[PDB]
Design a protein around this ligand. Structure first.
Ligand SMILES: CN1[C@@H]2CC[C@H]1C[C@H](OC(=O)[C@H](CO)c1ccccc1)C2
Length: 369
């Protein structure tokens, strides 16, 4: 009777005052995609939470008609915007992993802040006029969907399909990066080996697929390790041909590949693809292998590459867990309501599940720190 108001009263203040906090550069496209999630969470956590607080009364619902439509429209627009923005984030991560050169290079604040606008527009148009322009005593529900079949269909379409897409994409990127990290780890863990030695090159080839040139080089090196353009292909590496071709005289291929990885990671154009696999690696075996490659290169200037690559690796580990925290929170909190729609329980649990989709808001901004 009194704890209901307190829990949903402080959460709104902990969310609204916890969401205006994220609103000084930080122009990373990840932050651009998180901005819309933060705005939708703010709108929810203030308007929908307060109106549900006022709904949970002995008079069924106060301020009917107009407010019963306005609150419903705001809730069902902001929730769809949040789901579609999470889908956008997941697809962005998947394409950044899969196409690190064709697509990851062309990620700019423009042409990515336009995909954000389409996320809201295809959601606002679908949900706002469908109920606000559709024209019990206090009951407030979307009259345009007063049926069990309709609610099951909308729940499926707006939750399970995006959820299965997100899980498939996250699992795919996790496996794609994990296999490369394992192969790279075995490249140094086992010495005088051929299987792991070729596996490292295979993982490098799979990582770089959007340029064809780097792939051609990896195919050439695979053929060499088991014609005369080996030097011409290696000429793409500046200030590195003399050392690398020296190791190409002739076993010794363990030092050649580890030297090749450092040289590939040098150019910022195709660095992040290597940085991802390094980030999901053991951080010790890969560091030792990279140091071995640097020492096999002859150390022209020094170990000026290993230090910041690990810095870029950990800056990728933070972005990997942040996606997990936001996605996992959405999966856990929204599930109780969308399993209740599956079984179609008293109103004492329908309202308990309805506000469980609002506690997703407060835990959304915590990973942003
Ligand atoms: C209606 N509210 C309450 C609290 C927030 C919102 C969503 C929750 O219900 C759902 O998850 C459906 C699909 O099941 C849904 C509706 C709009 C957009 C995406 C998904 C319950």
């Amino acid at each position: 009777v009194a704890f209901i108001g307190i829990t949903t009263g402080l959460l709104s203040l902990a969310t609204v005052t916890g969401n205006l906090l994220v609103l000084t550069k930080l122009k990373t496209v990840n932050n651009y995609f998180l901005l819309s999630l933060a705005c939708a969470d703010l709108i929810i956590g203030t308007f929908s939470m307060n109106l549900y607080t006022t709904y949970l009364l002995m008079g069924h619902w106060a301020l009917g008609t107009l407010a019963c439509d306005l609150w419903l429209a705001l809730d069902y627009v902001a929730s769809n915007a949040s789901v579609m923005n999470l889908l956008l984030i997941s697809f962005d991560r998947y394409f950044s992993v899969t196409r690190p050169l064709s697509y990851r290079a062309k990620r700019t604040p423009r042409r990515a802040a336009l995909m954000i606008g389409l996320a809201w527009l295809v959601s606002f148009v679908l949900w706002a006029p469908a109920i606000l322009f559709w024209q019990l005593a206090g009951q407030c529900y979307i009259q345009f969907l007063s049926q069990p079949i309709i609610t099951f269909g909308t729940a499926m379409a707006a939750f399970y399909l995006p959820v299965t897409v997100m899980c498939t994409l996250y699992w795919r990127i996790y496996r794609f990066r994990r296999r490369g990290a394992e192969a790279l780890e075995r490249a140094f863990s086992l010495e005088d080996d051929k299987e792991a030695l070729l596996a490292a090159l295979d993982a490098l080839a799979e990582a770089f697929a959007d340029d064809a040139e780097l792939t051609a080089l990896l195919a050439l090196l695979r053929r060499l390790l088991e014609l005369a353009a080996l030097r011409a292909a290696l000429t793409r590496f500046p200030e590195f041909r003399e050392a690398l071709l020296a190791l190409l005289d002739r076993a010794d291929a363990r030092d050649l590949v580890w030297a090749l990885v450092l040289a590939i990671a040098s150019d910022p154009r195709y660095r992040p693809a290597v940085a991802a696999m390094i980030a999901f690696g053991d951080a010790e075996v890969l560091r030792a292998g990279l140091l071995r490659g640097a020492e096999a290169l002859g150390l022209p200037g020094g170990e000026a590459l290993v230090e910041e690559i690990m810095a870029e690796a950990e800056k990728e580990k933070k972005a990997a867990r942040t996606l997990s925290a936001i996605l996992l929170a959405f999966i856990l909190t929204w599930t109780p309501y969308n399993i209740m729609v599956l079984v179609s329980v008293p109103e004492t649990l329908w309202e308990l599940g309805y506000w469980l989709c609002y506690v997703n808001s407060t835990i959304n901004i915590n990973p942003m720190c």
